[PDB]
UniProtKB/Swiss-Prot annotation:
Keyword Disulfide bond carried by entry: yes
Positions of disulphide bridges: 8-61, 9-24, 12-57, 14-22, 31-38, 35-50, 40-48
Name of the protein in its database record: Bowman-Birk type proteinase inhibitor
Highest rank taxon of the organism: Eukaryota
Keywords: Disulfide bond, Protease inhibitor, Serine protease inhibitor, Signal
Site residues by UniProt (Reactive bond for trypsin): 16-17
Site-annotated residues for Reactive bond for chymotrypsin: 42-43
Coiled-coil intervals, chain numbering: none
Family: Belongs to the Bowman-Birk serine protease inhibitor family.
Subunit composition and interactions: Monomer.
GO cellular component: extracellular region
General function of this protein: Inhibitor of trypsin and of chymotrypsin.
Length: 67
């Protein structure tokens, strides 16, 4: 399907390259196992990055009162 809450993301960034490579710059509370390497700053609320690359962009599910 496509209505899946596997990941949400408000800011993807696909690279200028050949072939391309893409990733969600918009960091979250939850880091999903969709990307292989989840790293997290132990902040409050914590921030957490897909270090590992992807070739997809997920729809927006609005995290915090900013975006
Ligand atoms: Cl599904
Ligand atoms: Cl939705
Ligand atoms: Cl350009
Ligand atoms: Cl980054
Ligand atoms: Cl989240
Ligand atoms: Cl998950
Ligand atoms: Cl991802
Ligand atoms: Cl790993
Ligand atoms: Cl610190
Ligand atoms: Cl992938
Ligand atoms: Cl929302």
């Amino acid at each position: 399907g496509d209505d899946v809450k596997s990941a949400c993301c408000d800011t993807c960034l696909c690279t200028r390259s050949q072939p391309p490579t893409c990733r969600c710059v918009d960091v979250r509370e939850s880091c999903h196992s969709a990307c292989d390497k989840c790293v997290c700053a132990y902040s409050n609320p914590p921030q957490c990055q897909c270090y590992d690359t992807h070739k997809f962009c997920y729809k927006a599910c609005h995290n915090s009162e900013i975006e």
